[PDB]
Amino acid sequence: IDDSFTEGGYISVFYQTRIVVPLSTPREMDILGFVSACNDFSVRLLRDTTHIEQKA
Amino acid sequence: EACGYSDRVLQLTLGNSTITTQEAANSVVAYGRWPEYLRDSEANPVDQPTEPDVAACRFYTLDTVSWTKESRGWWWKLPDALRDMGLFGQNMYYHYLGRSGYTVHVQCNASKFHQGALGVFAVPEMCLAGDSNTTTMYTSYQNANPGEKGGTFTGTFTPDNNQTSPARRFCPVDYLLGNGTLLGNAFVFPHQIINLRTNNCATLVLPYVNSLSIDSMVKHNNWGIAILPLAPLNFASESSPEIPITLTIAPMCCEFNGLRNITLPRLQ
Amino acid sequence: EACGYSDRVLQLTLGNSTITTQEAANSVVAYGRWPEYLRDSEANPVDQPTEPDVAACRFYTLDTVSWTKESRGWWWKLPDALRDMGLFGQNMYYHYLGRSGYTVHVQCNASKFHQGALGVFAVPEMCLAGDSNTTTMYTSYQNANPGEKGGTFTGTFTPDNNQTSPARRFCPVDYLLGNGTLLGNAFVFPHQIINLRTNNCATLVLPYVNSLSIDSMVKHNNWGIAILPLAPLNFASESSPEIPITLTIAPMCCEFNGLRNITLPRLQ
Amino acid sequence: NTTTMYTSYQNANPGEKGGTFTGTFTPDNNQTSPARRFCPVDYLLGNGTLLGNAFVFPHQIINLRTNNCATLVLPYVNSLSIDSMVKHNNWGIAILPLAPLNFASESSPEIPITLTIAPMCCEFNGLRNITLPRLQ
Amino acid sequence: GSSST
Amino acid sequence: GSSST
Amino acid sequence: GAQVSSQKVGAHESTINYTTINYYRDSASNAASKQDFSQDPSKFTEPIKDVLIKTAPMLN
Amino acid sequence: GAQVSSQKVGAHESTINYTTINYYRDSASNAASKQDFSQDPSKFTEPIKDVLIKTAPMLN
Amino acid sequence: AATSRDALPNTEASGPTHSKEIPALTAVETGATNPLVPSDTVQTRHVVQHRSRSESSIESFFARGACVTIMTVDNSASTTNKDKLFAVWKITYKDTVQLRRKLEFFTYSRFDMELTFVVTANFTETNNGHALNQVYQIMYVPPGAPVPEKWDDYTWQTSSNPSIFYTYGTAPARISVPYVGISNAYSHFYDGFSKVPLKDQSAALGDSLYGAASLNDFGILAVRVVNDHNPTKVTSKIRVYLKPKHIRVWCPRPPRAVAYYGPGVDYKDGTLTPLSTKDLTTY
Amino acid sequence: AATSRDALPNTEASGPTHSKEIPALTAVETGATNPLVPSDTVQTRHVVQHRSRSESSIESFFARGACVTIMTVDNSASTTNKDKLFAVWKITYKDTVQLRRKLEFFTYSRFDMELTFVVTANFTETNNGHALNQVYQIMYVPPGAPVPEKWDDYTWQTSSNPSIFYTYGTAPARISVPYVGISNAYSHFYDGFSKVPLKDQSAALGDSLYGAASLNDFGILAVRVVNDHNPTKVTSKIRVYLKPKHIRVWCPRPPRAVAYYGPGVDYKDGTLTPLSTKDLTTY
């Protein structure tokens, strides 16, 4: 959960130089990002999620 | 390789057909399992199976679709998309039971000045959501099974309000993968991405997957192919670019049981 | 390599930082000497040295400058350019003595339709010429040491005629390498060229060089980095092209002696 | 006595000047602008336990007839191998007059107390930009 | 009798 | 089986 | 017919064991052993036909 | 999997023993053995750098 | 031989690097995830890793009873316009949402099923009166067996159907069932129909629901109060808890992201916006 | 190898002394306690010592269940201005004082926790009526899981949270939990904050309570009566008893000497005089 004591820090992305294109080329484009766990990753204390409910 | 072999340059040959590619991004074998014939220890129908081999396990090319800035995505189901493809289709409609694996090759080339990225997903049991909020599980067989033309995704859910004559079709919303789950997670299914700057094709080798060794190909689709624009098509400064997408699919290790007269389905 | 390894594609990792490049022109190790810690047989101050290791030997990125058709060139001094960089700068101002080597990575990408060539030179003891013909050796500490912003070269020598309030700055003329020798000969110093059609970066690994094993980093710069346009920037038919140049530098095998209170220099 | 656990970071962390103990508890009655500081009563060791028992903590006594200094070597102690030094203090140093200062017959004697402390075997992880805390 | 794991 | 302490 | 296995001990006060006897003929009646195996994620994380070497170019 | 230990007998009427079998996979479910160790108080009672000899002057 | 409770790999110490080895650079188009570990992109120390994935094994992730239904029964006098209430429930995990979402992380599964029954009763009318302790009959009627029509008819004889007679106020009832599927695994998703529509047949005759396989997949539970009625009315509820023991799963799926809307994958208009506002450059 | 139930050392006989050995003289400034025994300052006989410290081992000192909270629930009809009462409690040992004081003889601890639940009910209104035997659900909801808002909402399904369904009048309920801390030990005292106030940030934004670490340290217990309501009102209470089994402790502390005043070490004005009058030369 959001918790200051166990906060993880900050992910950010910056331009190091700039995107450069020739003529006849799109000047804007997208990047897509992906996240995954490394082989040293684990979880514990099983619990219900807040990501689904059933009202009535 | 110092003899020149590349991850990017492949040749696939099945039956009397060959595909070449010079801009591949390797190829995928779903769940690491290559297609196989049904083993005796897993067998279930006892009659001698038919195995048409090269007559059906060859590359069939479906109708080419068109990718534009307004495209939301496309879908197909297997074996449905191949139901009318040569002797594969015949074997399928003549038998109660059938099983098959597939090599799926999605084709889309453009130029070093175009950009865009297609997510190509092979989904086992790709159940899609219907157009109705008056009746659930109501998509008709005819609308669930488009054959080779496939279907499309939409960016908007819109409920069928004709209660007298319901459309009875799917209404598959793109960011919800047409099934109520988030598209960003579809990468847990076997996939490749055609990112135009990197590659011009996707190749997925799919094993037969099911909770049974063999089943009704006519009643049930084992795999769904979903192609969605993860990054939209773009070119130079043209407002209305277009590039084609072609699907070529080959059945693999297909076998059939329960021969009778041919099935003649109500498809319209 | 048949596994794909390339002269052009490199990864450098120091501390918590990694640089990747896909268009390198190999990399240079100045005078063939990799950086090293001070050996006991060459040691001089007797107190235990501090060796901050990963806290200081990591890549620091300086402010990005801009290359245009009118650019005459840029210069920086080491360690001056890094005097305010994290714990490296701290260690430098807390100690009388310090020594360090460096990995210098100059970054500048453009396109297959742009052209131009930057000479990137690492010069040991890069003494530059002053703006004065009334007093020699008069450039002030403040003007000799710009920190990370660096300085620039000029195509024209112009003598400071204010005798009342002299500028006391350098006036480094480009074809004279800012020091009275011809630029065409700067290639005897460790260098690389960023020629836009060939590569988008320069990488120079610099050992600590000095006539002493260790010295005052605050009083003395060991290396100078000089970047000059050997062939001017050009693009399509645009009259005013611009592409950025970014400097990222990492200290290597740095150690410090003579700990006291921190130095607080007059920099303006 | 209107809000518990309310001492602000700024008042909890005096830096090198430290804080002091008091012989008297006095509750902050400004509710509009609370002081938000500690009020550590000496015989209660500033924490609600009796000072006479503080000897179960690592200690020395500077008894002027016997010695002129105290030296304590402290290991890193925590319920974790490493932690935020900026958020958390591992050790507290408490100096209290067990027997009051006295000299000849002077009514107002004074002698200085100096603290010199050396970190030992210190290591750090998670390098980024520098923390700039609100200390006032 | 007994199995040990 | 059995352990003895 | 007793099965003796070891516990993985978390907080402590040798190997500590525990005992299990199945009381029923049907395996469906048994408790769960929790003695499970792990596998490598490769069939999902690296389903590519040509083995990936992480230090090498993924595209060559 | 039975653990057999001895009782320390207080009032009396050989060694008398008692038996213990752990019924669960998780050590957290176990009863407390009460088979505990003692240690010397030195880390609290004599935390001084130079070893104290009680017959000698503590200050020399 | 690597078990779920084994410690994960140690971090190995790694120092500075300058080479043609490029772990950080990759190409996600291939369909692969880059197998990196911290020592590939930063300098690391040696760490002896003690953590394990024991609690996230498929068994451990599912090792919990979840409520799948609440059945209501009563013990009232049957009278000409209203009978004593017994309950009938079609066995399923899709009437509630929590266990359903967990199983649906996967396409197929095999497991032994543990059912536990919690039973609670209360008086509904004001009057003083009393009821004596109730006994309940929970009868499983599998597809094809006679479903009870009245609380007291012949089907409650159970010569072959399994029944639990539960006594009120005793421990919650519990039974296990093996993997009973007619396939080699349970299908959490079936992209198909149970009927082929033939041209030579009417549309009505070839029609069937999308994604549905056997109409009575697993049968029903029928529950009744066995006692005769009291003058006072007592209503009871039977809460059913399902735990999948000895479980295996295949083919991972993205989890349900919008509210469930029926036994299929359908969604309801107005519920399709799971995500919330957050600015791109705001932490 | 010296065990808690071993006999303490024998007294050795000792006779008269006249030497430079000075056991009686010492210097407490050093920070050490003089390790003397009777034979150092008086003449002793030989005694074979049989006493042991078995009951004061850390385990034995804590080997008792202590009440840490009383939760109140009811089984009333929910009506527009008032709902059926279920209870929610933040797990802690600091709501009561006795176990808290014992644990606070130490700075840090590790233990497996045994929770036992005693449940009592009564009628609150005068009327005659009745209620049938109640079943209670004690659900653990760990930090992050949906806390119940109504006695009957979806969260009580518990697909993943552990719940105990307890039947009234049966043995008190009991479960064990392992050492679940996110640190290597539980901290009975944390001299710090969960947030660093930054200068570039508002004071409000950097603020946090003194001595508090994770805001929801261990989650909550949510308790309800599962039964539907009766015409008659019944109130129940769940008393929770905590026993630390398999315990280890570190860094001894002086015990609490003035009344507890909140979850921290704070004290209340007017309670700071523990000691009583007694004259210096009066026995």
Ligand SMILES: CCCCCCCCCCCCC/C=C\[C@H](O)[C@H](N)CO
């Ligand atoms: C006396 C009580 C006996 C109760 C016996 C119940 C037996 C029937 C068990 C059915 C198993 C249901 C498993 C869950 C559902 C399916 O997996 C999904 N729809 C997928 O096929």
Ligand SMILES: CCCCCCCCCCCCC/C=C\[C@H](O)[C@H](N)CO
């Ligand atoms: C079905 C009921 C399950 C109940 C499960 C309770 C699990 C949570 C246990 C929390 C452990 C609390 C230990 C005591 C408190 C802390 O030690 C102190 N504040 C120090 O950190």
Ligand SMILES: *C(=O)CCCCCCCCCCCCC
């Ligand atoms: C293997 O089981 C041989 C040892 C038997 C040990 C004692 C068994 C305890 C009671 C078992 C009852 C079995 C239930 C039908």
Ligand SMILES: *C(=O)CCCCCCCCCCCCC
């Ligand atoms: C070691 O335990 C072998 C001897 C077995 C002795 C009889 C066990 C009595 C019943 C044990 C039940 C275990 C609980 C899951």
